[PDB]
Amino acid sequence: ACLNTRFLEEEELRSHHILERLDAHIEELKRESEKTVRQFTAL
Amino acid sequence: ACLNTRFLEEEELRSHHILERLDAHIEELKRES
Amino acid sequence: GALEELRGQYIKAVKKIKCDMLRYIQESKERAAEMVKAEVLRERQETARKM
Amino acid sequence: MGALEELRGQYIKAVKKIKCDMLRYIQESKERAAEMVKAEVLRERQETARKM
């Protein structure tokens, strides 16, 4: 009944949010590493 | 109950597994580094 | 060169980590969805009662 | 040399944040599962009332 469906709907929302946070940590890595490469490559 | 207790049991096992193999993979690439 | 390749490897390694977490989260949703069917089926025991 | 340490440091930081996020997501998920155990023992009150 309605405990479990509402549980699932919550799971869905938390699934999207934890997903964002993972994409963030990746995008930050891409920006930090791109800068390290660019600047050390100038050497 | 025995439904939802069965549920909590399994999530304990499978969440412990996911953390295990992740701690393995961090130890992996740091020893590779 | 070497630094850009090393960057690509770290990126590809973390993306793998992300895939593992994704497959896990998908399995979360399936399990909680399987719960829904399981609760509907125990309602079946109580509607046999009501008959 | 320093680029290698930097890149290594950035990878480690990325994955250590992913682990922190999963650790909290999991702890939250188990509490929500435990809350679903309580909420349903309380739904037997309706059954035990029917039995009274």
Residue numbers in the entry:
A (entry chain C): 498 to 540
B (entry chain A): 498 to 530
C (entry chain B): 1205 to 1255
D (entry chain D): 1204 to 1255
Text from the published report:
The centrosome, which plays a central role as the main microtubule (MT)-organizing center for animal cell division, is a membraneless organelle composed of a pair of orthogonally arranged MT-derived apparatus, called centrioles, and the surrounding pericentriolar material (PCM). Here, we demonstrate that two of the human PCM scaffolds, Cep63 and Cep15212–14, cooperate to generate a higher-order cylindrical self-assembly capable of recruiting their downstream components, such as Plk4, a key regulator of centriole duplication. Here we showed that two centrosomal scaffolds, Cep63 and Cep152, cooperatively interact with each other to generate a heterotetrameric α-helical bundle, which in turn self-assembles into a higher-order cylindrical architecture that resembles the localization morphology of endogenous Cep152 detected around a centriole. Remarkably, short (~50 residues) coiled-coil heterotetramerization regions of Cep63 and Cep152 and their neighboring hydrophobic motifs (i.e., Cep63 P1 and Cep152 M4d) were necessary and sufficient to generate the cylindrical self-assembly capable of recruiting its guest molecules critical for centriole duplication in vivo.
However, our effort to determine the crystal structure of the P1•M4d complex was unsuccessful because of heavy precipitation caused by the hydrophobic motifs within P1 and M4d. As expected, a smaller Cep63 P1b5(502–541)•Cep152 M4e15(1205–1257) complex lacking the hydrophobic motifs maintained its 2:2 heterotetrameric state (expected MW 25.56 kDa) without forming any detectable high MW complex. Size-exclusion chromatography-multi-angle light scattering (SEC-MALS) performed with decreasing concentrations of the complex revealed an apparent biphasic mode of MW changes, suggesting that the heterotetramer dissociates in two distinct steps with estimated Kd values of ~117 μM and ~60 μM. In particular, identical hydrophobic residues in the parallelly aligned Cep152 helices appeared to constitute the backbone of the bundle by engaging in pairwise ladder-like interactions (top). Cep63 helices did not directly interact with each other, but rather interacted with both Cep152 helices in an antiparallel fashion (middle and bottom).
